[PDB]
Amino acid sequence: AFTCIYKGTSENDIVVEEWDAIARGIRFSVIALEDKEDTTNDRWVEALSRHTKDLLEIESYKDNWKKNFIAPCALWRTTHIENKRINYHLI
Amino acid sequence: EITKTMKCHVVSKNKDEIVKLLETLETSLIIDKRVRLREDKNMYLTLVSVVEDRESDMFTTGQLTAVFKMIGKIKREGPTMDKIYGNGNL
């Protein structure tokens, strides 16, 4: 499956006289062609996606979109990670 | 003092594998707070801060940014007073 997204329209509303017709190009797009898993090794993203699914009762995709997302939906991802050795025993 | 902000990449066809590899590398660098510069086990690179930016491009930029510092010592010696001697008079 997939999920097209509306994006716009062709440059103008052309007229083709030799064919005796008028034409207009609607412009769609599809997301994440190469993703097929919807899994992650980020435990935090898994935890918050589970939390969002339980609280909100909608789909909750992990780090990257999938081509067949079911609107409405949410996507939790990590953008930045900062580790810190606060103490000898703690991180 | 010599400081270097060394950035690291992780490439793989499986992006979840990239995440796992970065996670284990970060945890290793943190729990072991220094790295052996050479196998002689005399120099060391004490870690300052390791940070990952998952949005950053896999190839051009690199996910993980680490900052290491090292303290050298100026290599100068001199003669030593091994033996001292003296006499007494009045």
Beta bridge partners of A15: A22
Torsion, CA B26, CA B28, CA B32, CA B38, rounded to 10: -100
Instruction: State the Cα–Cα distance between residues B68 and B52, nearest whole angstrom.
Output: 15
Pairing of strands B64-70, B2-8: antiparallel
Beta bridge partners of A81: B52
Instruction: State the Cα–Cα distance between residues A13 and B35, nearest whole angstrom.
Output: 65
Instruction: State the Cα–Cα distance between residues B48 and B68, nearest whole angstrom.
Output: 6
* Listed residue (A22, A20, A2, A3) closest to A12, CA to CA: A22
Give the three-state DSSP class for A59. Answer: strand
* Listed residue (A83, A89, A41) closest to B66, CA to CA: A83
DSSP class of B13? S
Beta bridge partners of B68: B4, B47
Instruction: State the Cα–Cα distance between residues A44 and A65, nearest whole angstrom.
Output: 17
**Which residue of chain B is at minimal alpha-carbon distance from A80?**
B53
Q: Which residues of B touch A77 (CB under 8 A)?
A: 54
Q: What Å resolution does this PDB entry report?
A: 3.4
Give the three-state DSSP class for B17. Answer: helix
Question: Encoding tokens for residue A65?
Answer: 């979109």
Under 8 Å CB pairs connecting chains A and B tally to: 50
Task: Tell me if A91 and B30 make a contact (CB, 8 A cut-off).
Answer: yes
**Which residue of chain A is at minimal alpha-carbon distance from B49?**
A84
Experimental method: cryo-EM
**Beta carbons within 8 Å of B74's beta carbon, 6+ residues apart:** none
